[PDB]
Structures are given as C-alpha cells and as structure tokens.
Swiss-Prot record, chain A:
Keywords: Ribonucleoprotein, Ribosomal protein, RNA-binding, rRNA-binding, tRNA-binding. This is Small ribosomal subunit protein uS13. Belongs to the universal ribosomal protein uS13 family. HAMAP family: Ribosomal_uS13. One of its GO terms (molecular function) is rRNA binding. Part of the 30S ribosomal subunit. Forms a loose heterodimer with protein S19. Cross-links to the P site tRNA and weakly to the A site tRNA. Forms two bridges to the 50S subunit in the 70S ribosome, contacting the 16S rRNA and proteins S19 and L5. Residues 93-114 are annotated as: Disordered. Disulfide bonds: none annotated. It comes from Escherichia coli (strain K12). The gene is rpsM.
UniProtKB/Swiss-Prot annotation, chain B:
The gene is rpsI. It comes from Escherichia coli (strain K12). Keywords: Ribonucleoprotein, Ribosomal protein, RNA-binding, tRNA-binding. The C-terminal tail plays a role in the affinity of the 30S P site for different tRNAs. Mutations that decrease this affinity are suppressed in the 70S ribosome. One of its GO terms (cellular component) is cytoplasm. This is Small ribosomal subunit protein uS9. GO terms for biological process: cytoplasmic translation. Belongs to the universal ribosomal protein uS9 family. SUPFAM superfamilies: Ribosomal protein S5 domain 2-like.
Swiss-Prot record, chain C:
InterPro entries: Ribosome_modulation_factor (IPR007040), RMF_sf (IPR023200). Keywords: Cytoplasm, RNA-binding, rRNA-binding, Stress response, Translation regulation. During stationary phase, converts 70S ribosomes to an immature dimeric form (90S ribosomes) which are converted to inactive 100S ribosomes (a process called ribosomal hibernation) by the hibernation promoting factor HPF. Inactivates ribosomes by covering the peptidyl transferase (PTase) center of the 23S rRNA and the entrance of peptide exit tunnel. However crystallization with T.thermophilus 70S ribosomes shows it binds near the 3'-end of the 16S rRNA near the anti-Shine-Dalgarno sequence, where it would sterically hinder translation initiation. Disruption phenotype: Non-essential gene, 100S ribosome dimers are not formed, decreased cell viability during stationary phase. A quadruple raiA-hpf-rmf-sra knockout strain is significantly outcompeted by wild-type after 4 days growth. Very high sensitivity to aminoglycoside antiobiotic gentamicin in stationary phase cultures. GO terms for molecular function: ribosomal small subunit binding; ribosome binding; rRNA binding. The lineage of its organism: Bacteria, Pseudomonadati, Pseudomonadota, Gammaproteobacteria, Enterobacterales. Associates exclusively with 100S ribosomes. Contacts 16S rRNA, might contact ribosomal protein S18. It is found in: Cytoplasm. Pfam families: RMF.
Curated annotation (Swiss-Prot), chain E:
SUPFAM superfamilies: Prokaryotic type KH domain (KH-domain type II) (SSF54814), Ribosomal protein S3 C-terminal domain (SSF54821). InterPro entries: KH_dom, KH_dom-like_a/b, KH_dom_type_2, KH_sf_prok-type, Ribosomal_S3_C_sf, Ribosomal_uS3_bac-typ, Ribosomal_uS3_C, Ribosomal_uS3_CS. It comes from Escherichia coli (strain K12). It comes from the Bacteria. This is Small ribosomal subunit protein uS3.
Length: 114, 127, 55, 161, 206, 98, 79, 95, 101
RNA sequence: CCGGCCGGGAACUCAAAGGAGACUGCCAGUGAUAAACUGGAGGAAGGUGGGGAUGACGUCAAGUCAUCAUGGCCCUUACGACCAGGGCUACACACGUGCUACAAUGGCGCAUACAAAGAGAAGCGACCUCGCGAGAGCAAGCGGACCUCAUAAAGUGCGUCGUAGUCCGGAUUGGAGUCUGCAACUCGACUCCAUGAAGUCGGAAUCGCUAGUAAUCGUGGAUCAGAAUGCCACGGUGAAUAC
RNA sequence: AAGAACCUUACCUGGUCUUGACAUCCACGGAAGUUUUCAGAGAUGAGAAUGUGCCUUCGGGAACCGUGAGACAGGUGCUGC
C-alpha cells in the first residue's frame, strides 16, 4: 500500500484503488494492471509484495504526483509569463476556454462576495 | 382447422393463429418465456385463455410487430380474443364482460405547439 | 370531462342547506320545479335545526 | 371537480398473486414511470417478509396493512379567523391507499441498504405496531380524536352509505 | 388580425390552387420564383384589364398562364396581338414556351378581386367610401350573391385616426368549410396613406 | 418489364391519371400489375406566424406526395410508344424505368 | 488545437516577413492578420498586431511560436 | 423585496434610481411584506408613464400612472400601489 | 431589404460559381494525403489566400428572394417564413395546405 | 448456404383510395304528454368517442416603419457604397427559462429484447482496412416501402460497488488530437489522457398536470459549411388522485 | 434569431468611392469573356497576353463592359401615437 508516494487505500478493488494517485484515472489504471499482469478486481490486501513492487516501477512510467503538479504549474506559470489571452485569464481568475461570463462563470470565480 | 385473429394495441400489431393442439405458445419463432415470459406483464397473454380453457387444447402461433413490450402484450391479448371467433358468442358474450375486446384506442398524443410534451407548459412563475 | 354531479336533486338539497344556515329566512330563493323545490325547502328546514344547535 | 362523477377504469391484478391491492401497492412506489423494478422490490420484500414473519405473504402484507389503515382523518377548515381541523371518516377506498402511501414514504425514510430491505423492515414493524407509519396513524387518530368536537354542516360526507 | 385566411383554410375542400405543377425538391424553389415573377409582371402590366386571377400550370417543361379577367377584349387587344405580346415576355422570364389562355368571368360583380379593385380605384380618385363601399354591396346583392362583407381600413378621408368600416349584408359564414367564400384584398394608395380593402363574397354551400 | 412510377400532389388527380394509363396498357397489350399505391410523403412545415415576437403563435403545414406504380409485365411496341405522346394531367409527374 | 496539417499564415505576412528579415531588423510591421501563426523565423521582430483600433507592438519571443498573432493582442479593455 | 428598474426611452439616471428606490422602500415598509417589484418607465412623446408590478404572497398586483415629468407619474403610481396594498392586506386578514 | 445587401448576395453567387467548383482542386485534390505532400501542398494552402475571399460557398447567406430577409428561411421554398405564409394562404405553393393530426 | 433466402401465394400485417359505422339510433325509468336527464343492451367506439384546425362584435391609440408596403419628415461627396480587423461572446452584480446532478428504484462492466416518425444529390454515405477514439482511405448503393443516416434507450440476465463527497456528481483546468471552412486567438463542435468544484434533495415565495396525461427514456427534422441543453415532431415505459 | 468565427451585421476603429453596390434615360469607345504579374490588410490602382457571331440599316440591331452630364438612385434613418 505504498506506490508512487502514497497509494494507501485497502478493502477496495485494485483498478479503483490505484486512482488515488494524482495522475491516474480509470483508463491508465486499467493500463497499469493489464500491463503488469494483475486481474482488475483484487484487493490491495490481497496483493503480495512481489506484485506490488512490480506495480511501483509500472506506475513509474506514467507521470505521477509531484512531477505532474510542478509540470502543470510550469504550464500555467509559463502562460502567465507570456501574458497571452489564456494566461491573461489565468492571471485574473476568469474562464479560459471562452465560456459565458455575463451570467454563470462561477466555478472559476468562486463564491459570490456581494 | 386453423383460426385467425388480428389484434392491435398502442402502435403495435399482432397476428394470432390458433389451432386445436397442445398448450404451446410461439411468438415470432420464439417461446413465450424466452420472448417476454419473465418480463413485464406476461400474464396478459395467457389471461384471455383463463376465462376460457386452454390447457392442452390449442396451440398458438403469434407474430407481433411494432411497438414495445406491453404494446405487443396488449396486442396479443386483443389478437387471442379476436381469434376466439369460431368459439362463438357463448364465449365472446362472456368475454365482453371482462374487457378483452375493446381495442383500447388510447394512442400517444401529438406534441402541441408552445407546450413542451402536450400538456406541460413552460412555467410562467413568480419565482 | 364528464356529466353533472347528483343531477340537481341532492344538490338542490345542499343549496337549501347552505342557504338555510347562512340566514336567508326568506325560504324564497328555491328552484321552481317540484322535485328540486321540495328538498331545497327540505335542506332549509334541516338547516334551521342546525342553526339552533350552534350560534 | 364541479361536474363528473367520472367514468372510472379498473386496474390489472398482480401476476404472482391474485391481488389488485398489491398491484395498487406496486403503483404507489412505482417511481419515475417504471413498473418492473418496483415489482422486483415488492416481490423481494414480501419474500423476506415471509421468512422474517413465518406466515404467508398476502396475509403478511394485509395484516401488516391493517395496523396502519386509519378510520378518522382531519380536514382543515377555516371559519372567520379560526382554522380548525374537523374529523371526517375516511372512506374505505381512500383508507388502504392512504395506508400504503404512509408505508411507502416511511420506507423511503428509515434508510437501510436496499429498498426491499427498507420496505421489508417497515412492513415488519407495521406488523409489530412499532415503526413509523403506525406513529403517523396514531398522530392522525390523536388529532382527529382530539378535535372530535366538530360534526357539522354540509361540506363533508352526506347522510350515510 | 386574428382570423384565418378564408381562402387558405379551404384549399383542398372547396377552392382550387393557383398553381398546379409538381416539382421535385431540387427545382421547387426556382419553379416557384419564376411563377412569382410572371404574376407580379402580369399584375403590373394588365392593371387596366380588370384581371380576376391567373392560374399557372407547368406541363412538360412548358407553362400555361390562364388569365381570369372581366374584359378579355382589352386583354387580347386588336386581332389577338397582345396575347403574343404577353407571351414573349412570359417566355423570356419563364421556361420557354408559353400557352396563355383567357377565362373571363361574365359576372364581375361577384369576384372579390374586382370588387376590391373597384373600391381601390374609386378611393384613388377620391369618392366617398360609404358610397363605394355601400354600392359594392348593392351591386352584388341585386345580382345574385348569397352574402358579401366589405371592410375598408385606414385614414379614409384624411382623418388623423385610422378606423375600419364594414357593410355586410346576408350570410358570410367564415367557419363553415364547405361554404364557398371568395375572399380577396386590395390596397388603395391615397395621398393620406394606405387604405386597405378586403371583401368576402359568399356564394354557395357545395 | 416497364416500371412506371408517378407522383403528384392530389389523390383525386393522380387516381385520374392512373386510370388514364391502365386503359392505355390494357387497350394495347396486356399483363399490367395493377395500380399499386405507395406510402405518401408528408413534408411538414412549421413557421412563425407573426412578423416579430409572439414565438408561440405558429402555423403548421404539409404537402402530400402521392405515389403509384404500374408495372407493365410484357411490353408491346404499341405500348412503349403508347406511353409516348400521352403525358397529360399537369400536376402528375411520371417516370418510366426499363 | 486545430488545423491538422501545416500552420496558417497569409501571403501578405509570409512574404512580408521574408522580405523584412533579409532586409534587416527594421520598423515595426503593421499586421492585420491576427489569425496567423508565429513562425520561428519571426523571432526578434516588433510586429504591431491590429486589435480593432490600435496596432499594438509585441516583441516576438521564442516561446510564442506555437500560438497565433491575435493571441498576444487583446481587443476588449476591462477597467 | 428587490426593486428592478427598467426604462423604455427613459434614460434612468442615478438620481432617478435613488428617489424611486426610496419611495418604493417606504411603501413596502408601511403596508405589507413584499417579495419583488418591477418598475417600467415609458415615454411616448408626451406622456411620462410608469408601470409597476408587485409580487406579494397573495399574488401579482399592478398599477400604472401617467404624469408630466416622470417624477409625478412615479408618485401617482406609488400612491395607487399603496391603495391596492391596503385592499389586498385586509382582504387576506378578513377575520 | 437594403438593395446593397441584396446585390452583395448575388455578387457572392457570381464569384462563388466562378472560382470554386473549378478551382476546388486546390483543396479537394491537392490538400490530401498522397505521395505529393511536399511544398505543393504548402503551395496550395499558400495559394487559397490569393483567390478572392468572396468566392467560398460558405459566405452565402441564402436569403429570401422576395425580400432578402436574412433570418427565418426555408431551403425548400426560397422564401422567408412571412412570404411563404402570404403565398401559402393565397394558394401559390402547390399542394401546400394547413396541417392537423 | 433454414436467410422471406428462392419458386410461389393474395389470406394476414401493411400501403392508401373508395365505402360502411355512432345518430340519444333501440330499451327501462324521471320529467310540463316537451327539450332533456339517469341507467341498460348491442357495439371497436355512447352521449360534442380521443386530439387538432377553426378566434364572433370589440378592447388593450397592445407589437411590428428592422419581413414587406406606405403618408410625412430628415441625409444625399454622406445617416448612402466597398474592404480589413474588432464587437455582437465584455462582467463587481440582479432577474427569467432550461440541462445535469446530489445517488443503491443507483453507478460501472459484459451479454441481450422491443419502436414510430423523418431526411438525403456540390447530399445521405454501406462494406472492408488503419486509428484507443473523434475519424481517415478506398468505395458500392440511393432522388429512395429497396440504399444510407441507423447500434433506439430506459428494459432484461449476470457480476461488482455497501452509504462514503464514495466506483456519486463532470464543473473547471493542463496536455494531445480530429473535422468543417480562405480562416476555430478573441469565439465552433467533438475525441483521448489527466484534473475532480459546488452539490448529501433546496427558507420565504412559486409552477405544470385529470390518462396514454404527469414523470422518465431514447429517436428524427428544420435553420446549417461546422455549431442544440432551445424549438418543432415521434415513439417506449407509464402512475397517483378528484370526497 | 428555424442556428453572430469571416459572411450574417444593421455597431465600432481605420482605409477608400462618388450618378454611385442595385434600376432606367443620353452620348462615346470596346465583343463579352479568359490566363498571369506588381503594390496594398483588402477594397482598389497599375499592367502584361488572349478574345471577336448574331444584321447589313452597317458611327450598328442586340447581350455585356468602361468614362462623362443630370433627372435620380439609395437609407436596417425618425414617427407603430
């Protein structure tokens, strides 16, 4: 119950249980078990350590927690350093993709202060 | 010999051929149980064969098409009663009483304009 | 969309009963046919007693 | 309505048991226009009502139902400034449907894992005179019997049957 | 502005269509466009000819304009030359050739287009609209219409407020679908603005 | 072998032009497979009815395309030219197939 | 995230760059083609993208290559 | 009670919105609990007219006042609304 | 509705039929995957800017042909929703009548 | 080659032209012997059978001078005409109409059953290869009861999830793409990987709905190069209640 | 509004045209049309080649294109009171 830095659930099935890693979801999580020879419905208590070490270097291929967080921070901070339109929206907290801003915009905005 | 009743219900039409035979019911070259006989309202095809007797008396070759599950089911329920035409108003006079011969002509209504699904109106509300 | 409720016979009753209770001691707002006037007045006189039993 | 003692239609009986009361009960918790899974909830609940009660299923449901069917029901009326509730007797068609609505709501509460387990336990305590729908039954009888002093004019339940 | 068009509500039942051509969906629009332009063109050109209604048919890459008028002598002109004078300019703006016909009405006091053109022209030359609007009703009813209703609308004598008048006489049942009602509408461009004239003429039941 | 399919807007005019071709193909030759009806196309057009606002006031319309088959089984040379120079009742459109 | 094959430029921007690069680093290039990409032989230039009422100059930097010219010239002004 | 102001051909200035709002608030406080109020200002070449729609627990109630200077129309509309409110209020007291 | 706009529409019809469907080979034949994906293809997507911009079929508006009204059009009829009611109730569009079912 | 697949058949579904049928026609009672009402029979349907179209005289000096037409006024080297770029998509906020949820009557995975209506020629686009996929290449067929869009979905059987912000929810954002069109930056749609917000059923106030209705589930059309959570249609499942 | 990237588009900033983008009347030239270059954001302006029948009245009769004088054209500009 320690891969990629954390991986601590138990009593869960394996392909759902790997998805607490920041960088994996239900497709890459099936790619890990299908690429590491593990059936998808086993539990983390039911894995033996001679499988779990073969899953640690398996998930060491795709980018995980820290490298992905400083990577996405490099992307957003890069755009804000260029000062393009997208990064100009990132510097101000408005929708980047071109959503409606007259009415909703409220996930990127936050709560409503007035 | 062989006797026929048409029967239809809710955009769904049956063709019922009844013969003096065993107690088997065939629907669209399948059996009843493997067509819908554990699905929703399987009783409504054996139901007109309950006020009359059917046990190993008459086998049924039914081809229903169009509509859905209970539309085909009520279609067959009308088709069997229509196919009790050689078994006369001794049986159909006692088969008026429990229904079974009205076509049950309730069709789905058309969507009216301005209304959303023919009665629902788009909520002039004060809040 | 269906047909009238209790075809003025014992609706004529409860009109005479409501009109009996809410004052109207005229007994001079009935129907004019006999089978409805008879129990407009019937509900009226059944409503006088129900006025004595209360305020 | 103002008019129309309406041309009334009947219902289909239940397939697995010879009952139309049971088919009405399926139509009560038939949420969202979907009869088949409500039939699976009802059958799955009467099975464990039989195993958790010993006796048969139709009599299990009916004995479990007659401890929540009511007799008197309040009707809220206002005259002048007051707005008091007046006990009307429930008519025996409305009676069992008003029982089953309380069973089904009290099963939508109470939350266990499954709906057949919730409704099975709720019918079990309805046999036990213990659960929620008997508390609502006794609330209705306490407030109609508490407001019993009103038997009057014409706006409710003419002479007899 | 709340009634159905009483010529259009009964288009399969009583009245015939003004166009009797089949066109598949690739040529239906243009086949209706040139169909429009010969009606605009003939309506503009034959304005003195007292035209009732023109019916366009398209047999086999050709065209036929049947011209319903009251005075076919002004239409054919001297010797019949003006028919060909119309037919060359019809064939230029339609699919060449053209077989135009005339189908005159011998009772022009019962045609709703010609009554409305009559009241239109008389209001253009400034007659009293009760005299014109009433004289149309008289001239239909003493000639054999089972009903008529004329309505004029607008300034109607230079008033600062517009109003309508209408002088029905007899039966004009607008809701009976088998009832034959010739409705038509014309417009009179007076120097105070537009005066709209619409006339219903009820004739029979089948 | 001739597949004559014809479509029009009025049923009481296409059933007139169909009787104007069965009497042809039975007047000369024989073996016609009946006036076969086909399903009617029902193009529906819903338009707004005011020149401005009042969206809910509409006007629904339809045109009807009626179709009929003929199916001449054995053609005669009087029949294939009897189809020619006889194409009247404008409003009916005809197609021959071989 | 569009235009599968080849970047987009106009001929009056491509020929205007290939004219004004071999002719030395010069005056800022007035451009109206906002919709065109930024090629790596445009690095080092002051191009003035038209935003609607200005021609705002932006020095083309190395990171700006995959973007377009209108991306670095805002149109609406807020506060 | 939130007052919504709108104007057909009447440019709603900030001094105009302050006064109308004050008058509406004063009326709302005096007669009944009011949920929402819509105000419409129209100018038709001579007539400065005003419409108001109050949404109150009983329901909608509306009034309209023509004036000379807009302010007069607003005052008339507010007095009319107050009168309507008195009627609705004890119309649903009626003990 | 604005004769300027109406003539602008027929100008775009004229150039849209003049250039493309004759020089649609610059994209429908050249700008493809083949063994010709060199600077002939870049010469093609380079080339379509030289053509008049008002030659593409996607600058058409498909207006009404009695009024030029840009909104509310019918491709079957060629008329806007006002004029097709005006001609439908008159009896112009053949076979068209009011529908009810 | 058990595929309506093939000779064949014209019964049946169906197509869609013509007819028949339902009119208080018959019976019993009530009623001024009247109109009518209540109940019964027969019948597919019984009391204007269900639904639509149809909107009286008028009101609101309601809406439209930006569909059009038109009286008057105003501009006519500009309020007219052409082009590029932008804006119509801005956002402290307020209101209206909707979609998706908050889950176990469910989510997910596998297997599998049943529709009606419609559209299609610079268009709809099989099959077969390549791609995880949006899609790409070749390319038949079809101006269509034939060919294509086009696998209906809810449902059903099996397995798992065990009541948690969870295997709910799918917002936002990053990366990589596809298609359309000269051209997806402002500002398109979609796909893939990742990210995983609010939300645990909504105060005061408020709306629709009486039966194939409500409520849910999918499908199609127009407008359209591309761009529906809207509109207009169609079917599936299908209630409660009216004293 | 039954579907605003351009167009639509009516609004804004700039770049231009004036009997005009669209219609008629008068005169003078030219077949119309077609391939390509330069400049420019494009409109536009400059070109470079190609092209020539319908009736003999023949400077034409057409269709089409340019320049010139106005009568005008045009206006989604105001008034739905």
């Amino acid at each position: 119950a320690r891969i990629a830095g954390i991986n601590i659930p138990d009593h869960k099935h394996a392909v759902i249980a790997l998805t607490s890693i920041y960088g994996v979801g239900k497709t890459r999580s099936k790619a890990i078990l299908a690429a590491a020879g593990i059936a998808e419905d086993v539990k983390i208590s039911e894995l033996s350590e001679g499988q779990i070490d073969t899953l640690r270097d398996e998930v060491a291929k795709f980018v995980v927690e820290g490298d992905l967080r400083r990577e996405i921070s490099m992307s957003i901070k890069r755009l804000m350093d260029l000062g393009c339109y997208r990064g100009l929206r990132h510097r101000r907290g408005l929708p980047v993709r071109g959503q409606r801003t007259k009415t909703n915009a409220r996930t990127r905005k936050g709560p409503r202060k007035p | 010999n062989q006797y026929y009743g048409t029967g239809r219900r809710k955009s769904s039409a049956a063709r019922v051929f009844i013969k003096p035979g065993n107690g088997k019911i065939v629907i669209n070259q399948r059996s009843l149980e493997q067509y819908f006989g554990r699905e929703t309202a399987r009783m409504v095809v054996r139901q007109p064969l309950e006020l009359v007797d059917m046990v190993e008396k008459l086998d049924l070759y039914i081809t229903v098409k169009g509509g859905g599950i209970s539309g085909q089911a009520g279609a067959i329920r009308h088709g069997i009663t229509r196919a009790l035409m050689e078994y006369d108003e001794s049986l159909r006079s006692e088969l008026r009483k429990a229904g079974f011969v009205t076509r049950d002509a309730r069709q789905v209504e058309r969507k009216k304009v301005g209304l959303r699904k023919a009665r629902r109106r788009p909520q002039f509300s004060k809040r | 969309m269906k047909r009238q409720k209790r075809d003025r016979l014992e609706r004529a009753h409860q009109r005479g009963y409501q009109a009996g209770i809410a004052g109207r001691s005229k007994e001079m707002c009935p129907y004019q046919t006999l089978n409805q006037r008879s129990q407009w007045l019937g509900g009226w006189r059944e409503a006088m007693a129900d006025r004595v039993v209360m305020a | 309505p103002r008019r129309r003692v309406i041309g009334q239609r009947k219902i289909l009986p239940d397939p697995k048991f010879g009952s139309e009361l049971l088919a009405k009960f399926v139509n009560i918790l038939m949420v969202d226009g979907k009869k088949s899974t409500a039939e699976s909830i009802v059958y799955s609940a009467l099975e464990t009502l039989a195993q958790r009660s010993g006796k048969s299923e139709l009599e299990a449901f009916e004995v479990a139902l007659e401890n929540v069917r009511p007799t008197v029901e309040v009707k809220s009326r206002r005259v002048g400034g007051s707005t008091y509730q007046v006990p009307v007797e429930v008519r025996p068609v409305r009676r069992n449907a008003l029982a089953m609505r309380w069973i089904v709501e009290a099963a939508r509460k109470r939350g266990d894992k499954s709906m057949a387990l919730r409704l099975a336990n709720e019918l079990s305590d309805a046999a036990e005179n213990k659960g929620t729908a008997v508390k609502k039954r006794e609330d209705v009888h306490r407030m109609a019997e508490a407001n019993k002093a009103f038997a009057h004019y014409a706006w409710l339940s003419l002479r007899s049957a | 502005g709340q009634k159905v068009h009483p010529n259009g509500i009964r288009l399969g039942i009583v009245k015939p269509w003004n166009s009797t051509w089949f066109a598949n969906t690739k040529e239906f629009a243009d086949n209706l466009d040139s169909d429009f332009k010969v009606r605009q063109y003939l309506t503009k050109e034959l304005a003195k000819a007292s035209v009732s209604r023109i019916v366009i048919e398209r047999p086999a890459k050709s065209i036929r304009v049947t011209i319903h008028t009251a005075r076919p002598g002004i239409v054919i002109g001297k010797k019949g030359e003006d028919v060909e004078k119309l037919r060359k300019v019809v064939a230029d703006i339609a699919g060449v050739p053209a077989q135009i016909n005339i189908a005159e009405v011998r009772k022009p006091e019962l045609d709703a287009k010609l009554v409305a053109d009559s009241i239109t022209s008389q209001l253009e030359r400034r007659v009293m609209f009760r005299r014109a609007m009433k004289r149309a009703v008289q001239n239909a009813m003493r000639l054999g219409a089972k009903g008529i209703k004329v309505e004029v609308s607008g300034r109607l004598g230079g008033a600062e407020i517009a109003r309508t008048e209408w002088y029905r006489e007899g039966r004009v049942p607008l809701h009976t679908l088998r009832a034959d009602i010739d409705y038509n509408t014309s417009e009179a461009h007076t120097t105070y603005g537009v005066i709209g004239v619409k006339v219903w003429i009820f004739k029979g039941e089948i | 072998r001739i597949r004559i399919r014809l479509k029009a807007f009025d049923h009481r005019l296409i059933d007139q032009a169909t009787a104007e071709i069965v009497e042809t193909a039975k007047r000369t030759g024989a073996q016609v497979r009946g006036p076969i009806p086909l399903p009617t196309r029902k193009e529906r057009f819903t338009v707004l009815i005011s020149p401005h606002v009042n969206k809910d006031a509409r006007d629904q319309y339809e045109i009807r395309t009626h179709l009929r088959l003929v199916d001449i089984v054995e053609p005669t040379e009087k029949t294939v030219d009897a189809l020619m120079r006889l194409d009247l009742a404008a409003g009916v459109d005809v197609q021959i197939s071989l | 995230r569009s235009l599968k094959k080849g970047p987009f430029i106009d001929l009056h921007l491509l020929k205007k760059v290939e004219k004004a690069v071999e002719s030395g680093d010069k005056k800022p290039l007035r451009t109206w083609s906002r919709r065109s990409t930024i090629f790596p032989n445009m690095i080092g230039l002051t191009i003035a993208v038209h935003n609607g009422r200005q021609h705002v100059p932006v020095f083309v930097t190395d990171e700006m290559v995959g973007h377009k010219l209108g991306e670095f010239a805002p149109t609406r002004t807020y506060r | 009670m939130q007052l919504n102001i709108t104007g057909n051909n009447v440019e709603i200035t900030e001094a105009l919105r302050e006064f109308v709002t004050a008058k509406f608030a004063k009326l709302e406080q005096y007669f009944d609990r009011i949920n929402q109020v819509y105000v419409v200002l129209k100018v038709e070449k001579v007539t400065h007219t005003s419409d108001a729609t109050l949404h109150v627990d009983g329901g909608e109630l509306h009034a309209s006042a023509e004036g000379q200077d807009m302010y007069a129309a607003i005052d008339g509309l507010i007095d009319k609304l107050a009168r309507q409110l008195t009627k609705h209020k004890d119309k649903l007291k009626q003990h | 509705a604005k004769q300027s706009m109406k003539a602008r529409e027929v100008k775009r019809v004229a150039l849209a039929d003049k250039y493309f469907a004759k020089r649609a080979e610059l994209k429908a034949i050249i700008s493809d995957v083949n063994a010709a994906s060199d600077e002939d293809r870049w010469n093609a997507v380079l080339k379509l800017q030289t053509l008049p911009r008002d030659s593409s079929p996607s600058r058409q508006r498909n207006r009404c042909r009695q009024t030029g009204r840009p909104h509310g059009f019918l491709r079957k009829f060629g008329l806007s929703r006002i004029k097709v009611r005006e001609a439908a109730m008159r009896g112009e569009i053949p076979g068209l009548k009011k529908a009810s079912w």
